[PDB]
Design a protein around this nucleic acid. Structure first.
Ligand SMILES: [Mg+2]
Ligand SMILES: [Mg+2]
Ligand SMILES: [Mg+2]
Ligand SMILES: [Mg+2]
Ligand SMILES: [Mg+2]
Ligand SMILES: [Mg+2]
Ligand SMILES: [Mg+2]
Ligand SMILES: [Mg+2]
Ligand SMILES: [Mg+2]
Ligand SMILES: [Mg+2]
Ligand SMILES: [Mg+2]
Ligand SMILES: [Mg+2]
Ligand SMILES: [Mg+2]
Ligand SMILES: [Mg+2]
Ligand SMILES: [Mg+2]
Ligand SMILES: [Mg+2]
Ligand SMILES: [Mg+2]
Ligand SMILES: [Mg+2]
Ligand SMILES: [Mg+2]
Ligand SMILES: [Zn+2]
Ligand SMILES: [Zn+2]
Ligand SMILES: [Zn+2]
Ligand SMILES: [Zn+2]
Lengths: 48, 129, 151, 89, 61, 57, 229, 196
RNA sequence: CCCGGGUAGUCCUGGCUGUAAAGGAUGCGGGCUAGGUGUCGGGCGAGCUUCGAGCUCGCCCGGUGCCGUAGGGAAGCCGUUAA
RNA sequence: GAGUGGUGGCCACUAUUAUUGGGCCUAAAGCGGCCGUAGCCGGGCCCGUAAGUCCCUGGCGAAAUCCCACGGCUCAACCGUGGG
């Protein structure tokens, strides 16, 4: 594996896309954004 | 392919000074490399240097003194305003006046201390300490 | 490295740095241009003409004389031929690659199962397309010119 | 967004049960006869604020910075914490 | 040092055995070098340095 | 007053507290003191006396 | 300080040196702690440091960093062994770190304290922080790095009165060397106490490896060894 | 001119190297013969011998140590120690002789002489750790790593080693003043070498 | 599993399928950072020779192996064919 | 300490989302291999331009909220006059 990419000055779009793409591999992020706990909680988000 | 002559020169210098070489040859020369060498010599980081002509781009011959902890190029070349030098110093240097950042301005290539004195900004291109 | 094979051969010419033509060279510019025109009319390629001039007449490259008409530039073989109207219509390396490709296309008609020689054809045509793109950009070829193998 | 909410004026320890810190604070509490820890913590916060202002102004330059520098020195030596010839250091 | 490249080939001033003509030729030819007057062979090409069949007079700088 | 830290004869860098350096009088003249740091000794770097000019290991 | 003078006098008379450096120190040809560094000597007798730096024996100048017990397996059961990690210093400019082993805890502690004296080093102190430019030796004079095992340590100069912003092992080691304020950053597994301690020790040793000019000594207030007011 | 006639140097075989070479020994190599064997320069050997004679004469006589693991070098170092008063260890070097104070023959010298850096690797390794100057005899095959004064010679032959140590002992004696002239030194070269 | 038999298949011609521990378990281009020693292709120099497109030694470029200094690494190990 | 505990949420811890600043031989991870379109990254010198970039100066980005000094409620929390 070579140097981390992209590093160019005018390559912001691809860099933002890369970070957005690999954030979905994070299980904490995916469950909050898709609201997976809310869909199956018998308490419906209540504390009691 | 070759993409950046200035990065090659600085990585070559920092590789050579770690094994105690006394001189180096910078193979693709350019005016920008000459300016960086002049600024480095003014502050005592290198000895004398000279230009040698082949039919190609030319070569630089440099004398080392064992006074460089580290030297490198900055990519990309970030713009910097005349009152923002402190954070780049904290990013690249080890103490509050230890070493120099080398800045390209519309009045020439100079160290960041001279540029801060004149009150102008520019582009960061290298660091040496 | 090599464009497709990624090998790293280094062999080539090692030209000394000189500005003025050597003292022992006695030809003037008129003689050299006469010689170049004569050799071209014998039918040699541009790369071959310089080889003959170096080998037999003792003339290291003609890129040692200033262009008599335009002082801004030095003299080259293609420029000398342009001054007389004998310069090639298509750039030579493109022509050589096209010639190599045509001969290989008739080999592959009688040998359809020669799959290793076919990859060579594909690489040759990739080189041709790179070259035609470069020449279109610089204006050495018309905008309509196209490489079609059936031509 | 949200309207303003009034915030506490003191800071609590990052770990509640550290032996050395407990010993030091007990010594201070007994000597000066304070009612509870938060009282002590209140004063600690004051000190830190002063320090945080001095660290910021040593590294600043311009016209407003000098005004704030002399204001800090004047406020400190009006309270009786510094001699009348003290410097920012 | 060897920072500047220097060629290992030389230009030679030779004398034809038959015609007596004097010429300047290259030491590493890629073609057959022949006399400019009579047409006899002077240097034969090889993989590297060429085989000289004429009398060598001088090695040019 | 303070004390001065010795400096390598070949490279000019200071000697660290626990490195395998060495020092000795000049073999040829015996009037100057040669210091060699660990890196110079490992790499067989030459040295040169400041008084007589005799050089090298 | 007065007690340690007569302690050093007492040790000096009843000591029979076995090495060359010991012979030099016994004869009085070497009189200060700084004269045994930077010339390639070997240090094999613990009495040298006792005579030259008597205050490393004070209870407040020694620290037991950790105690572990490790097992070797045999057909007749498990054989237990103790490992002790310890450090000493003079709280001014000198510090040492050592490991000792033994069949019981007391033997291991004694050997660990003994080896820490043989591994003594001297460091450089100063002030190099952007928001404190006071020229007094209360911190490191510039950013330094060290490593051991998987642990990487970076030490950063801090303002006066800040404290030691580092884990506890680093706190003790830096306190014994005479440093009051620092920031830090780490990578790796810091719960492995031996590697953490060694990494901090290496970072301190590397202050001698940075090239400096005479202007910088004046600017950062750099002091080598004893502060000496 | 020379410490001995060059005929003597060549007759002892001082100039005979081996099949291999190293980059750092090339300042001493003279030429290479047609069968792949390298030859040493004889004038460099003489000059370095004179310098080494001047250098060792300033040390206290009983603080010099000379070692030789090789069998052909054991007799010359023993005779050299007998003449000059230095300690000599021929044969196996016991590990810890210079690093373990509990060993019976513990001894810390001021300068060491190595007959062959490759064969005497234990002694060199221990000498690096106590920070003393190292003087060694080097062949075309050796490295100059951690050598402070090098004397280029054949360090494998019998007569060669005998002659080298004979000359060095005479130089030490003359420089430190125990004989008033080089000629007064009446001890034959044959007394220095191993017989049969 | 071992022994005696045995269909598809393995082979050729024209097509489809697109899979392997398809592993150097190591994506590709460029600059730089000690040495030592084998072997394959080309070139240069010197010495032999039964005159061979032959043999031995040395140097330059490009492939292909081993041991190893600085450095790297959790270690095994890698180390100008870099990890 | 007039408070002190339990449950659920967000930030920190976390360099477990990494521009600053992570990894991919053996631990998760280099497409079975290669050719090439957009995109990103691109050798040396001379002349021009002034789009990016840097400096100076006009018109704007409400009030409240944030930081500092001084003044009014016993001090403070709060509120006023000024500077940011
Ligand atoms: Mg709303
Ligand atoms: Mg058993
Ligand atoms: Mg390690
Ligand atoms: Mg069967
Ligand atoms: Mg396979
Ligand atoms: Mg060959
Ligand atoms: Mg190779
Ligand atoms: Mg290896
Ligand atoms: Mg957590
Ligand atoms: Mg990770
Ligand atoms: Mg693959
Ligand atoms: Mg794979
Ligand atoms: Mg491609
Ligand atoms: Mg460019
Ligand atoms: Mg503009
Ligand atoms: Mg507003
Ligand atoms: Mg009032
Ligand atoms: Mg008030
Ligand atoms: Mg208000
Ligand atoms: Zn003729
Ligand atoms: Zn050195
Ligand atoms: Zn001298
Ligand atoms: Zn300070």
């Amino acid at each position: 594996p070579g140097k981390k990419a992209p590093n160019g000055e005018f390559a912001g779009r691809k860099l933002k896309l890369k970070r957005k793409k690999f954030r979905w591999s994070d299980i904490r992020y995916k469950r909050r954004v898709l609201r997976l706990k809310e869909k199956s909680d018998p308490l419906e988000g209540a504390p009691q | 392919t070759l993409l950046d002559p200035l990065a090659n020169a600085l990585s070559h210098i920092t590789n050579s000074e770690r094994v105690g070489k006394r001189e180096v040859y910078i193979k693709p020369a350019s005016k920008l490399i000459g300016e960086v060498l002049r600024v480095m010599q003014k502050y005592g980081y290198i000895g004398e240097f000279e230009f040698i002509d082949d039919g190609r781009a030319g070569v630089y011959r440099v004398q080392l003194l064992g006074k460089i902890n580290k030297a490198g190029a900055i990519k990309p070349r970030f713009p910097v305003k005349a009152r923002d030098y402190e954070r780049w110093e904290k990013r690249f240097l080890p103490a509050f006046e230890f070493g120099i950042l080398i800045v390209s301005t519309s009045q020439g290539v100079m160290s960041h201390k001279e540029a801060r004195e004149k009150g102008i900004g520019g582009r960061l291109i290298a660091y040496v300490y | 490295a090599r464009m497709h094979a990624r090998k790293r051969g280094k062999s080539g010419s090692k030209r000394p740095p000189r500005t003025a033509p050597p003292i022992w060279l006695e030809y003037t510019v008129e003689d050299i241009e006469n010689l170049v025109v004569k050799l071209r009319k014998e039918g040699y390629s541009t790369a071959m003409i310089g080889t003959i001039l170096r080998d037999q007449y003792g003339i290291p490259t003609v890129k040692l004389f200033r262009d008599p008409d335009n002082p801004n530039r030095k003299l080259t073989i293609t420029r000398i031929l342009e001054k007389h109207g004998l310069a090639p219509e298509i750039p030579e390396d493109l022509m050589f690659l096209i010639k190599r490709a045509v001969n290989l296309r008739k080999h592959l008609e009688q040998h359809p199962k020669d799959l290793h020689s076919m990859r060579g054809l594909q690489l040759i045509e990739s080189k041709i397309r790179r070259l035609v793109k470069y020449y279109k950009r610089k204006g050495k070829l018309p905008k309509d010119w196209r490489y079609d193998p059936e031509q | 967004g949200d309207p303003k909410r009034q915030r506490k004026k003191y800071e609590t320890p990052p770990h509640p049960w550290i032996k050395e810190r407990l010993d030091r604070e007990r010594v201070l509490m007994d000597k000066y006869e304070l009612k509870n820890k938060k009282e002590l913590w209140k004063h600690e916060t004051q000190l830190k604020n002063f320090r945080r202002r001095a660290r910021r102004l040593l590294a600043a330059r311009g016209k407003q910075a000098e005004i704030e520098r002399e204001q800090l020195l004047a406020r400190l030596k009006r309270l009786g914490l510094l001699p009348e010839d003290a410097v920012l250091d | 040092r060897n920072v500047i490249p220097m060629p290992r080939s030389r230009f030679l001033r030779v004398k034809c055995i038959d015609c007596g003509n004097e010429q300047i030729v290259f030491s590493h030819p890629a073609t057959r070098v022949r006399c400019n007057v009579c047409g006899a062979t002077l240097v034969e090409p090889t993989g590297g340095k060429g085989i000289i069949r004429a009398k060598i007079l001088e090695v040019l700088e | 007053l303070k004390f001065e830290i010795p400096v390598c004869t070949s490279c000019g860098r200071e000697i660290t507290p626990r490195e395998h350096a060495t020092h000795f009088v000049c073999p040829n003249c015996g009037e100057a003191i040669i210091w060699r740091c660990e890196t110079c000794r490992l790499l067989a770097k030459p040295y040169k006396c400041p008084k007589c000019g005799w050089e090298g290991p | 300080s007065q007690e340690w003078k007569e302690y050093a006098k007492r040790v000096l008379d009843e000591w029979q040196p076995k090495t060359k450096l010991g012979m030099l120190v016994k004869e009085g040809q070497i009189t200060d702690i700084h004269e045994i560094f930077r010339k390639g000597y070997q240090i094999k007798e613990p009495e040298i440091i006792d005579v030259l730096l008597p205050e490393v024996n004070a209870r407040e100048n020694q620290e037991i960093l950790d105690i572990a017990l490790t097992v070797r397996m045999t057909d007749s059961g498990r054989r237990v062994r103790f490992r002790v990690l310890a450090a000493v210093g003079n709280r001014d400019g000198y510090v040492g770190l050592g490991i000792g082993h033994g069949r019981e805890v007391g033997i291991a502690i004694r050997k660990a304290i003994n080896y820490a004296k043989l591994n003594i080093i001297e460091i450089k102190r100063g002030c190099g922080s952007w928001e404190c430019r006071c020229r007094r030796p209360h911190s490191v004079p510039f950013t330094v790095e060290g490593k051991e095992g998987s642990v990487r340590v970076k030490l950063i100069p801090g303002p006066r009165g800040l404290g030691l912003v580092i884990g506890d092992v680093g706190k003790k080691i830096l306190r014994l060397a005479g440093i009051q304020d620092v920031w830090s950053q780490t990578l790796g597994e810091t719960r492995t106490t031996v590697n953490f301690a060694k990494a901090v020790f290496n970072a301190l040793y590397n202050t001698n490896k940075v090239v400096v000019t005479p202007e910088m000594i004046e600017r950062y207030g750099i002091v080598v060894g004893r502060a000496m007011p | 001119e020379y410490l001995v006639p060059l005929d003597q140097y060549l007759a002892a075989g001082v100039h005979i190297g081996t099949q291999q070479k190293t980059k750092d020994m090339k300042k001493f190599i003279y030429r290479v013969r047609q069968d792949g064997l390298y030859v040493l320069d004889v004038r460099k050997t003489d000059e370095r011998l004179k310098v080494a004679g001047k250098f060792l004469a300033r040390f206290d006589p009983q603080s010099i140590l000379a070692v030789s693991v090789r069998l052909y070098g054991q007799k010359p170092v023993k005779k050299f120690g007998e003449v000059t008063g230095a300690r000599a260890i021929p044969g196996r070097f016991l590990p810890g002789t210079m690093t373990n104070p509990a060993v019976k023959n513990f001894f810390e010298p001021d300068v060491i002489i190595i007959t062959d850096p490759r064969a005497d690797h234990q002694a060199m390794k221990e000498a690096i750790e106590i920070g003393i100057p190292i003087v060694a005899l080097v062949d075309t095959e050796n490295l100059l790593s951690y050598v402070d004064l090098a004397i280029p010679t054949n360090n494998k032959g019998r007569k060669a080693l005998a002659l080298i140590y004979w000359i060095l002992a005479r130089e030490i004696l003359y420089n430190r003043g125990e004989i008033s002239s080089r000629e007064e030194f009446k001890i034959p070269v044959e007394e220095f070498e191993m017989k049969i």
